[PDB]
Design a protein around this ligand. Structure first.
Ligand code: GTP
Ligand code: MG
Lengths: 949, 167
RNA sequence: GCGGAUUUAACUCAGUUGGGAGAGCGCGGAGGUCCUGUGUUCGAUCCACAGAAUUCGCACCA
């Protein structure tokens, strides 16, 4: 069997083989774990060095390890012991562990698992004996081996990261206490001597490993063993040795984070006299990142120690706050470090410090002393916020660099926002002068190299007043005087900024104009340039690729929010050059053959759709007589309709004709998406002429679903524009769309329907009746299908969502009667269960599905006619009392609601008797239903957690 | 210049899909759990030359991963993949790492959160801290939209070649 | 180190699983960006995602 395994493994390791050979092999080796006898074969191989391949021994070692995992101590103490003596005899020899790395590493792993099942009692001498051997055979290679076993034991008992089982944890805590109560003093003593020894020998490899063990274990061992005078001295020393400097700062940290009583850290923290190290801490960024992390570590501690109200001695508060203000210089030095890895290693300290700082300013005003600190903190934060004035901007939207930068800006902002909290006037002024300052300096530079400074200026500006959107952001609620926001914004709008070429600058400008458009609500005379700006060759007609598309959206948002008047006509004229559609078929990642989807997904058509919408907002909020407005209306709908007729009449199969039709329908749909709902408006006629055109194209291309979405969409916009003037043809629409229905559009369909069910409520009733039968069985069929992949499960959840919401709408808008029109009689029973099934799945499915299940009870509250509402109502019981056996409150909260509504019995006679009968709990439930909406919920949640516990 | 890259992750995280996408360009919407290991010689181009990657697509299913850690032997790099849609596939990311290093002392490991195309996310962005605690390169990626699909290979290639300038 | 709650006018509390939101109190009327930002939709206070403020546990250090 040995030579077989050796082959199996060899087989599996060669992918130059037939699958037939791998099958047998792969299953043979895996058989080893499954088999009761399998492992005996690996037991013989792992030790064999003269006759076996490392490759084989590995798979045997690994096997053996997994096998050691599942053997219960008491029931297999014989085999576990058996495999130990074997590993130990092996480990003792010391002559094969200098094989390849995997063979030594995997050995360590088995030993540690063994250890984990026998140490507390069965393996008393584990540390004495192992250490005695490592010391006996005096060589680093061996010490290292030992050192790694210690790290491995920690990996299995100190790593918070792995699965956190309540048992494994109780089982883990035992090994900890065992190690603590038996050989900890010597494990550390052993390690120490090694650090000391290999340290003098200049053997940095092993000293490193030692320093790790100390880092790892400090988290959970007698700190005293680690913070004695002789060991510390050895550390501080390592702090000045290139080779050991870092490991030392990493372990230094761990000593500092070792959790304990506030008065306890203070000493430790004090005793480490780490400030001198800080005083000195040259260009090695890795190190600086280590020191930073250490400072940050010490910083976060002291701030937490200074916030505990436990021990009130100011002695503690004095030395603690004294040591903290002492760390401030450092905190700034590194927060400002050009290297971004370094500065971030202190955010947490900054984070907490500031919090503590505004907790202290809530009581009294900050000290002149601190006001400077914050000021100096902003000075740093501002430095990190700017683009590097050396490396030119990347036009790459995938540059990991730009993505990492944006992340730091996202944080650097909350620091500014917190500082603001501590002193909004300090922040305000300081920022105004920073933005003003930055813009001033920008003017003194060649355009080519001034952008960074401007981008920063418009950035801060863009954010300065995020969320502050009341007229109080602009003007003082009492003096009515301008706000630093009003002043910053003013400066910018008046600054040349708008004439700068750089993308980031132009975009950010328009973004600022959109976001704070309400600002201009006061200064109305300044609107023309903002509108002419977007319009001009910098804003909407930009020659930059990213800006041009993105520009059209902002202009739409700008115009949408800036409606009053006098910019109507010119805006419409300037948009012209941009309204003709030219989508070309293109090849893709998912489309060897150009698809309407691929062609369009690569165009700027979606973005352009905002112009059409804009042009419609300009025409409804503009000073244009009914004649002039209706003129532009019908001048555009006839040109689009026209592009559809020419496309329709030619070969309907062509992607070019299809594309053409789709866009023509989309543009008209978005054109109407800007006009106000249905007084007699000028546009009406012109939009009703377009409604007829959908059918024309729906008749010939109704086959293709893309056109169908475009139809369900556009007609809904026009209906929300025309309203009742289309109602008579609504059913002809519904009908066509139904047969070409697919599975992909079961959701675009449902919303199109409720979209209408909303516009005309009572009117859509009869239509829904004749249609519910179709929509139901489709939904029923695609939801019953267990998913075969992610996308499937995704497509299902969405459906699940809209399906429920549909039925909730039906009921909430007054449609229940339709479910009963004979067209849907055979469908009532399953519909209810459908919903009842979505509730027992696992929350979005249970909170909204359980809710629908409830309204269904209130609407059908009497056995009168409903022959399956009792057993269904009654069938909901097991749900209300058994589900939560195996977010959860909304789940249980609404589970009770169902109980309550039903409640306004069969449970006493019938239910309790089936389930194990709890006399005490059975009457407390009826008391809750009978005598307690609010009160019953409480009983119910506490009740079940109890029933469940 | 061929390098062994073992791809490991929990079951259903998209390892195979990721592979197919780069080998054929096709995106497989159906889930067919890999068994044992499938191995394809994905290759690439670079300013300095052609780097080949022998990808060992491993199975992350407890059921079909015979020779689970065996496959990591003599591996020269690796990708540890998790599903952003499935929470636990992250909670286990440590293990995959722990295992990988147990065999391969020190290799360039790339941690990848897959399926970022699906909006909702079970593995929220605030929990993804493993790469920053284990000095590992990370990448939010998607086998469906090809989002960052080449980051993982580029990075590794740039390390295995010690040439940061590599593309 | 994990894991949950909370955040609606001056006040004080209601309330919907997205159709524009209110009773008491407080100057025939008046008064809220339903914590913020971003996204998904024809449209969100009520969805998704990102974050802030307030806060309650559990685990480790013990
Ligand atoms: N939306 C989306 N789905 C993905 C992506 N990657 C994978 N999937 C889905 O996950 C499924 C593929 O999972 P697999 O790659 O076959 O999982 P696997 O790699 O075989 O798992 P193993 O066999 O253990 O390696 C497909 O059906 C996809 O729908 C992605 O990037 N985006
Ligand atoms: Mg696979």
């Amino acid at each position: 069997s040995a030579q077989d395994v050796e082959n199996a493994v060899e087989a599996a390791l060669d992918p130059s083989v037939g699958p037939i050979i791998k099958q047998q092999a792969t299953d043979f080796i895996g058989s080893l774990r499954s088999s009761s006898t399998g492992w005996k074969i690996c037991h013989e191989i792992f030790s064999e060095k003269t006759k076996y391949k490392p490759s084989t021994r590995l798979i045997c070692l690994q096997t053996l390890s997994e096998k050691v995992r599942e053997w219960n101590n008491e029931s297999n103490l014989l085999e576990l012991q058996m495999i130990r003596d074997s590993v130990w005899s092996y480990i003792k020899e010391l002559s094969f562990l200098d094989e390849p790395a995997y063979i030594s590493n995997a050995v360590q792993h088995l030993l540690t698992l063994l250890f984990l099942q026998l140490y507390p009692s069965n393996w008393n001498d584990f540390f004495a004996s192992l250490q005695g051997v490592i010391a006996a055979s005096s060589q680093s290679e061996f010490s290292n081996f030992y050192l790694k076993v210690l790290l491995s034991i920690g990996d299995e008992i100190a790593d918070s990261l792995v699965l956190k089982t309540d048992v494994q944890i109780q089982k883990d805590n035992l090994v900890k206490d065992a190690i603590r109560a038996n050989d900890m003093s010597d494990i550390v003593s052993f390690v120490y001597e090694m650090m000391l020894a290999y340290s003098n020998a200049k053997n940095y490899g092993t000293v490193g490993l030692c320093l790790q063990v100390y880092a790892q274990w400090v988290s959970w061992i007698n700190i005293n063993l680690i913070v004695n005078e002789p060991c510390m001295n050895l550390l501080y020393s390592f702090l000045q040795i290139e080779e050991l400097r870092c490991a030392a700062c990493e372990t230094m940290t761990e000593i500092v984070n070792k959790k304990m009583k506030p008065l306890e850290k203070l000493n430790l923290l004090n005793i480490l006299n780490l400030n001198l190290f800080f005083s000195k801490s040259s260009t090695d960024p890795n190190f600086d990142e280590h020191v930073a992390k250490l400072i940050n570590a010490q910083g976060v501690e002291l701030v937490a120690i200074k916030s505990d109200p436990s021990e009130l001695s100011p002695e503690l508060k004095e030395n603690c706050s004294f040591q903290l203000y002492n760390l401030f210089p450092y905190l700034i030095r590194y927060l400002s470090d050009d290297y971004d890895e370094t500065s971030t290693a202190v955010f947490p300290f900054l984070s907490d410090l500031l919090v503590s700082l505004r907790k202290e300013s809530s009581s009294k005003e900050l000290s002149a002393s601190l006001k400077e600190f914050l000021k100096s903190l902003l000075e740093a934060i501002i430095k990190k916020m700017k683009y590097d004035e050396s490396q030119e901007w990347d036009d790459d939207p995938d540059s990991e660099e730009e993505a990492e930068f944006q992340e730091m800006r996202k944080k650097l902002k909350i620091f500014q926002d917190t500082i603001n909290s501590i002193d909004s006037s300090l922040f305000s002024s300081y920022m105004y002068s920073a933005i003003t300052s930055s813009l001033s300096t920008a003017a003194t530079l060649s355009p080519e190299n001034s952008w960074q400074l401007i981008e920063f200026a418009l950035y801060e500006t863009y954010i300065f007043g995020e969320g502050l959107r009341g007229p109080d952001a602009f003007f003082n609620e009492v003096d009515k005087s301008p706000t630093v926001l009003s002043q910053i914004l003013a400066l910018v709008t008046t600054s040349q900024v708008c004439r700068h070429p750089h993308p980031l600058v132009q975009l950010l400008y328009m973004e600022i104009l959109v976001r704070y458009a309400s600002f201009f609500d006061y200064e109305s005379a300044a609107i023309p340039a903002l509108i002419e700006y977007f319009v001009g060759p910098r804003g909407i007609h930009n020659t930059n690729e990213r800006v041009r598309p993105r520009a059209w959206y902002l202009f739409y948002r700008f115009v949408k929010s800036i409606k009053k008047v006098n910019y109507t006509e010119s805006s419409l004229a300037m948009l012209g050059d941009l309204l003709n559609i030219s989508v070309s078929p293109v090849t893709d990642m998912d489309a060897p053959v150009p698809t309407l989807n691929s062609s369009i997904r690569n165009s700027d058509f979606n973005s352009q759709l905002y112009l059409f919408e804009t042009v419609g907002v300009l025409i409804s909020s503009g000073n244009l007589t009914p004649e002039e407005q209706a003129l532009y209306c019908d001048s555009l709908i006839n040109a689009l309709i026209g592009k559809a007729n020419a496309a329709l009449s030619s070969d309907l199969s062509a992607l070019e004709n299809i594309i053409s039709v789709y866009c023509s329908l989309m543009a008209i749909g978005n054109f109407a998406k800007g006009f106000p709902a249905r007084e007699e408006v000028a546009w009406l006629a012109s939009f009703n002429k377009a409604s007829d055109e959908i059918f024309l194209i729906l008749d010939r291309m109704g086959f293709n679903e893309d056109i169908r979405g475009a139809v369900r969409f556009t007609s809904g916009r026009i209906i929300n524009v025309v309203g009742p003037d289309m109602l008579p043809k609504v059913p002809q629409l519904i009908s066509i769309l139904l047969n070409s229905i697919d599975m992909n559009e079961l959701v675009d369909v449902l919303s199109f329907i409720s979209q209408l069910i909303h516009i005309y409520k009572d009117n859509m009733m009869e239509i829904t009746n004749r249609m519910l039968p179709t929509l139901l069985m489709r939904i029923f069929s695609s939801l019953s299908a267990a998913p075969q992949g992610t996308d499937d499960a995704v497509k299902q959840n969405d459906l699940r969502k809209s399906y429920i919401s549909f039925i909730l709408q039906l009921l909430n808008k007054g449609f229940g009667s339709i479910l009963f029109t004979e067209e849907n009689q055979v469908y009532f029973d399953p519909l209810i269960n459908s919903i009842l099934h979505f509730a027992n799945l696992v929350p979005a499915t249970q909170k909204s599905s359980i809710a629908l299940v409830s309204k269904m009870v209130s609407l059908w509250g009497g056995k009168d006619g409903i022959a399956g509402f009792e057993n269904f109502t009654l069938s909901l019981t097991p749900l209300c009392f058994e589900m939560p056996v195996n977010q959860s409150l909304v789940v249980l909260g609404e589970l009770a609601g169902l109980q309550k509504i039903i409640l306004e019995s069969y449970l006493v006679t019938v239910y309790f008797p089936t389930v194990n009968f709890p006399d005490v709990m059975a009457s407390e439930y009826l008391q809750a239903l009978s005598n307690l909406s609010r009160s019953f919920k409480q009983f119910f949640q506490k009740f079940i957690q109890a029933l469940k516990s | 210049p061929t390098f062994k890259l073992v791809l490991v992750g929990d079951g259903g995280t998209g390892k195979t899909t990721f592979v197919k996408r780069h080998l054929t360009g096709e995106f497989e919407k159906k889930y067919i759990a890999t068994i044992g290991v499938e191995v394809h010689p994905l290759s690439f181009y670079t300013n300095f030359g052609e780097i080949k990657f022998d990808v060992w697509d491993t199975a992350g299913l407890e059921k079909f991963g015979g020779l689970r850690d065996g496959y990591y032997i003599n591996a020269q790099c690796a990708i540890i993949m998790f599903d952003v849609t499935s929470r636990i596939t992250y909670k286990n990311v440590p293990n995959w790492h722990r295992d990988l290093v147990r065999v391969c002392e020190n290799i360039p490991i790339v941690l990848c959160g897959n399926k970022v195309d699906v909006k909702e996310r079970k593995v929220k962005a605030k929990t993804i801290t493993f790469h920053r605690k284990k000095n590992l390169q990370y990448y939010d990626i998607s086998a469906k939209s090809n989002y960052n699909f080449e980051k993982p290979f580029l990075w590794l290639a740039r390390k295995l070649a010690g040439n940061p300038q590599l593309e």
